[PDB]
Scaffold this active site. Sequence first.
Site, PDB file in Angstrom:
ATOM      1  N   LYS D 153      -3.107 -16.752 -26.963  1.00 25.96           N
ATOM      2  CA  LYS D 153      -2.780 -15.394 -26.950  1.00 25.96           C
ATOM      3  C   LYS D 153      -1.365 -15.602 -26.866  1.00 25.96           C
ATOM      4  O   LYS D 153      -0.963 -14.432 -27.445  1.00 25.96           O
ATOM      5  CB  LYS D 153      -3.649 -14.898 -25.562  1.00 25.96           C
ATOM      6  CG  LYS D 153      -3.361 -13.433 -25.351  1.00 25.96           C
ATOM      7  CD  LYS D 153      -3.799 -13.123 -24.169  1.00 25.96           C
ATOM      8  CE  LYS D 153      -3.549 -13.219 -22.805  1.00 25.96           C
ATOM      9  NZ  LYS D 153      -2.011 -12.550 -22.541  1.00 25.96           N
ATOM     10  N   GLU D 179       2.278 -10.976 -12.052  1.00 25.48           N
ATOM     11  CA  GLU D 179       1.939 -12.124 -12.816  1.00 25.48           C
ATOM     12  C   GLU D 179       2.520 -13.305 -12.079  1.00 25.48           C
ATOM     13  O   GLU D 179       3.257 -13.367 -11.274  1.00 25.48           O
ATOM     14  CB  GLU D 179       2.735 -12.231 -14.206  1.00 25.48           C
ATOM     15  CG  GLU D 179       1.852 -13.029 -15.185  1.00 25.48           C
ATOM     16  CD  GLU D 179       2.820 -12.971 -16.541  1.00 25.48           C
ATOM     17  OE1 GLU D 179       3.732 -12.687 -16.462  1.00 25.48           O
ATOM     18  OE2 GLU D 179       2.078 -13.799 -17.549  1.00 25.48           O
ATOM     19  N   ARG D 180       1.870 -14.297 -12.396  1.00 27.60           N
ATOM     20  CA  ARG D 180       2.189 -15.590 -11.590  1.00 27.60           C
ATOM     21  C   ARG D 180       3.657 -16.345 -11.933  1.00 27.60           C
ATOM     22  O   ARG D 180       4.250 -16.222 -12.894  1.00 27.60           O
ATOM     23  CB  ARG D 180       1.049 -17.133 -11.808  1.00 27.60           C
ATOM     24  CG  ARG D 180      -0.226 -16.369 -11.618  1.00 27.60           C
ATOM     25  CD  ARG D 180      -1.104 -17.770 -12.172  1.00 27.60           C
ATOM     26  NE  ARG D 180      -2.425 -17.473 -12.272  1.00 27.60           N
ATOM     27  CZ  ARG D 180      -3.118 -16.693 -13.085  1.00 27.60           C
ATOM     28  NH1 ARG D 180      -2.262 -16.049 -14.085  1.00 27.60           N
ATOM     29  NH2 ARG D 180      -4.590 -16.448 -13.038  1.00 27.60           N
TER      30      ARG D 180
END
Lengths: 187, 501, 254, 465
Positions: D153, D179-180
């Site tokens: 992706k 987000e991480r």
Amino acid sequence: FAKLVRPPVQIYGIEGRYATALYSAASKQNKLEQVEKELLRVAQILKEPKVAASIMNPYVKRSVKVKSLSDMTAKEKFSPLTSNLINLLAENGRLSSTPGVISAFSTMMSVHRGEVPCSVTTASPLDEATLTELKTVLKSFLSKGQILKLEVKVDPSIMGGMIVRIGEKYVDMSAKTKIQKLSRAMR
Amino acid sequence: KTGTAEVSSILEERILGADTSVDLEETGRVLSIGDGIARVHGLRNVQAEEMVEFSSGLKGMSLNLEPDNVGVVVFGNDKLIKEGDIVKRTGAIVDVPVGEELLGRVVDALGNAIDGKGPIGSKTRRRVGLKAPGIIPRISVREPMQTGIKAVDSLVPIGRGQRELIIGDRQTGKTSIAIDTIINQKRFNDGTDEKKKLYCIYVAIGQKRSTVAQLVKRLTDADAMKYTIVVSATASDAAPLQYLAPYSGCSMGEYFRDNGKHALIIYDDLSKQAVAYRQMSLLLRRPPGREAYPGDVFYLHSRLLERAAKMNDAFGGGSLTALPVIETQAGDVSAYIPTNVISITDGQIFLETELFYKGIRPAINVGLSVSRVGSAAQTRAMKQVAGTMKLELAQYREVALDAATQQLLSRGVRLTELLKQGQYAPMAIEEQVAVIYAGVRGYLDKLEPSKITKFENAFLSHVISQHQALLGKIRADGKISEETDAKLKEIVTNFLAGFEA
Amino acid sequence: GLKAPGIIPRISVREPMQTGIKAVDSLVPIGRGQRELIIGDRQTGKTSIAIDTIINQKRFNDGTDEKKKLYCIYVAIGQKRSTVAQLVKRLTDADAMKYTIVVSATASDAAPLQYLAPYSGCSMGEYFRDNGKHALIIYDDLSKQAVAYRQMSLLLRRPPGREAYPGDVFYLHSRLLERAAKMNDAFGGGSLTALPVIETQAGDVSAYIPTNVISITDGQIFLETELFYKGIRPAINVGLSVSRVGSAAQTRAM
Amino acid sequence: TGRIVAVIGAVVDVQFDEGLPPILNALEVQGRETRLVLEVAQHLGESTVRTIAMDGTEGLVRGQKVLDSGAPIKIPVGPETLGRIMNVIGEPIDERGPIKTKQFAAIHAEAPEFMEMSVEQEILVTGIKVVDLLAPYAKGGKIGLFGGAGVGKTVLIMELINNVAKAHGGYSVFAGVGERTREGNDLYHEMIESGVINLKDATSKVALVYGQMNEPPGARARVALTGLTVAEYFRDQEGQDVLLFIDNIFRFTQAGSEVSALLGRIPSAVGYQPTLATDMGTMQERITTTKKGSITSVQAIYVPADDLTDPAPATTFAHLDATTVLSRAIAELGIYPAVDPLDSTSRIMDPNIVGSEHYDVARGVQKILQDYKSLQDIIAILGMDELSEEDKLTVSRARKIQRFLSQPFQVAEVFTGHLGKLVPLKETIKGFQQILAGEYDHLPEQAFYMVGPIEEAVAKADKLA
Ligand SMILES: Nc1ncnc2c1ncn2[C@@H]1O[C@H](COP(=O)(O)OP(=O)(O)OP(=O)(O)O)[C@@H](O)[C@H]1O
Ligand SMILES: Nc1ncnc2c1ncn2[C@@H]1O[C@H](COP(=O)(O)OP(=O)(O)OP(=O)(O)O)[C@@H](O)[C@H]1O
Ligand SMILES: [Mg+2]
Ligand SMILES: [Mg+2]
């Protein structure tokens, strides 16, 4: 809306909302001492069995409890802004909490010259030289030009020491120095 | 028990003398704001449901009167309002501009133009909170309202004054039924018979703003924006502007109904209104019910769809037809909202998401689509032919090398392919009755199934030209007599000899 | 209450963290800085997988190679005192209590002491990350911290939410697991590895707390109860277990 | 100025005296080390506002001092923001010095009006053969990217940045919503090693906005607004054709239903907020095609508990115009990009939008790819030779088509060694119009694997043997 002056204590509750709204109208027009002398006499003329009755009695009406109070505050001494205050307390049903508004106002007006008094709770009352020495070192601690008041309480549960509070300070020299002997155990 | 107006900014007005330079009868302040509603102090002569005006230019409705304050529902955003404002009293119930002089504009829900063409020029104002007519002035429906779709006009017929649902999932062709209704009225509004004229109203609730804009072009491209109003509260508008959008949209159609004209309104859609009324209810701390909805969702859609009625001849003779749209989640016709509206409207139209994928368009479920009161009001030319196709579409549905099965499985597929229709091609009434004639009288029973969409586009394109003066007697006399059907037998059987297979 | 390091002081995970289980190091590996969730029902060997990972690092912790040692911390959140007294003796027998710390907030202790105890272990596992060393931490278990925090909320009159949890239970677990990081060489080269244990109920991972901690961490090890009685012990399901550092934490031989 | 009266969690209440600020303003606490921005959300009466914090709240004393900006949160915007990393309040978080620019913009801004929208659909071309033929991209629309990790992706993100800056000339913004930190560091260094961001000069093609996961729940909801202000500069001031990446959209919804429950509101259905349909409305209506330029958005979509009718993936689905799905079962077949041709849909796929030449070509491709899907089961169970001779060509042609959808990317020139091809639109329609008719059927299969246009296919049959 307009702005309102802030009191130096700023208490909260349904009784603090009425001791602040009067302090924001009597600090304006420079009438903070005229209301205080009036409020210490409206506390006397409420607690009579003719007048303490039929103000907490719920089965009269709202309007005829106003008219029995709108002439009582008009004939004797008062026609200031404070006559609207008793007129407003009787409309909102808050006539029961009138000692709460008065007792809040005295401490809110105290701090304009007051000092939030002390508490020395050690033992039996001692001689005069020990009392005047603490009253002349605590005067050096306020640094605000205000003549401090003080209370003394007797509590024999403290072994040989004394606890002293100055407002919200609370130094401590008491039997808790015996509880600090856990360093012999907890180490 | 602490009181909303026990604050120190209002006690100070009373404790410092009862002040004279504050009105407190026609104008008040704002104590708090942020959850939608505002807490307005004062305004001691306000009515219930009366529009007020803020100092920022926002309208607001007086919803909830209390002994201390007033709770004003704010139309539009609530960032522009601040605590300490001043709100003025208009003096009238919430009402919208209405009249003949709106045909061709795009307004928002409060009645202001957002197409950039100047003011509207209106003279009359009707309320949004009026009641439906009673039991006496109504009468049963008798005039037909044509659709131009071959599946609707012959299987679930509509009439002037009948509510009809359009219910289906997402991307099944819901709006493309409602668009072809507005374009099909071009043949009647540009004529001389005034008794068959019909206007239109479109209400867009919770849609995207860029989908309404590509819709008013398609109406302008087909000369259909000269008899159509559009009310618009899109998805970026506030929640009170989507709740009051169909009420202002229906009050513009109630003008034509009471003055002898016929109207038509398409709410699109009533699903996104009920998720906007849910938001205002739970922000007022009301007890939720099924699916966290409030208890009076049925009052929301019944008091709106009861107005669409047909008056009697002593009241003018007008009408008002409604066509709401409900969106279901994965074929769920047993949920809370799609059953509260089935139990109001006078029929249904079902759009399957698994016939829209197989290539049948419009994907109308013929088994579950019914129209109760509108069956007696249709053309006798259509009833003479579509009454037969109702039988064969039933006998195709039980059988789903044997005898008496491979005959009905042959005809029943040639009638399914006969009811497909391209987009934006609204057919007239008397051109339908020749194409349904060839499929039920037994003429195209020999052809292949793949070459029948080719057949309808060739037969109609010629009989509209060489037999144009012989087709008009169907529409004029309104029926198929013994001389027309004997004449119609020769038109088809001479065309099949010339149609190259 | 300190913060995590940002984006700049981190580097990608490359060194292997050796567990000693033949199914973990073959199919679902763990690098030195990855967060890996041990999820499963009651009584399926979730504590036992995280108790031989402490034992296995003895072979490096008595040697000479300074950049291969590992330090283990074990946090018990709401267990009975007799169970912790049996687990210290298991780690005393294998001579693995000379490099391990155990932080015990048991069941009898008060409701906020089971809230501080996850944040009182990362602060002992960040002293080894700040000084160029390596570490490991095990939260046993995180599903008893969200319960000891819900009781503190509803007694302080805070607005509830789904399953009476407050609105910030995602913010409770995120700022605890984001403190595990692989530092770079300019700051020391340290690391911190975090293994949280989560107990599901009837194998439903779609609850509130089993979906918060799944979306924070990297991969899960899903121990079933059906395979435990069919003979497969340790009962790791490799059909549902993943790791998104992938094969970049395995040695070249494995 | 104001004073703080109440501190409860991540909700601070501020008492003012004269200058009561309106809703959606931004305050700033005085006396602390780092910037702590409070956002006003409710007027509580008696000159008291209800603010949501944006960083840690501890260390705050009752009765501190709080200033006022008089405006919403204003970020550094400009063309010199390309290639930098910022949080929700505009501060730089990569230690490369302060960002210097001319003007600022506010994040809380209204939608475009009704008279400014585009009145026609228009296809955006990105160069990829599988995207621009079967599930084409409308200009201004919203795109949903199904698929997660291990499918490939983050290459498809890095390649749509590169092709729009070549064929169209429009930059992009990346907005990481909750987000991480570990996965928001690898995307920094994967873009460096592919050229789309550059530490040496001013040829960068993206701007990064990263609101990471360990931040308070008010600061994870405004990141998709800060990362839309920057995307509105390159349309309102320069007139480009911008892209916009949000990863993902479920952490924007879920971070909304934790502010609306810290503020004391009754929840709606299954646990969400009452205002689930306007927060998705007052964000995604700013992503549109005005008269100057456009903004196109590619959004990642995570479905909770595999429920397609849950209200978080049901509010979002009414805004999308095209969905592309990354199947892992095509990644084990060798095809890159791993876009499924059968399970991708487009709303603008229509004979009255893209014309009849695009239509009847792309219609026949999905029909022939179904017949191979139905005939692959008889061959697997029964056997091969029983089927007809007319069906052996459909088995052979559909293995030519599903390998002609492969395409080598320009972002992978260093690793797989091939040359990156950017195919225009008129080559992809011309190519598949000939494979269907049996015109290039006698050539073998590997002539079609990993080529550009149809011209380079026959130049690869010569090199075999
Ligand atoms: N009769 C038809 N023939 C061919 N295509 C059609 C037909 N009717 C509709 N379509 C196609 O269906 C698509 C969607 O139709 P429509 O906009 O009515 O769906 P919708 O249900 O309104 O979508 P949503 O409600 O989600 O906005 C259109 O783009 C159109 O191309
Ligand atoms: N590899 C193994 N082979 C056989 N038995 C094992 C294995 N691992 C653990 N067990 C047994 O399983 C039992 C329970 O395991 P354990 O306590 O680790 O599970 P748990 O789910 O962590 O417990 P709890 O539910 O209390 O957290 C123990 O008695 C242990 O003897
Ligand atoms: Mg629609
Ligand atoms: Mg255990």
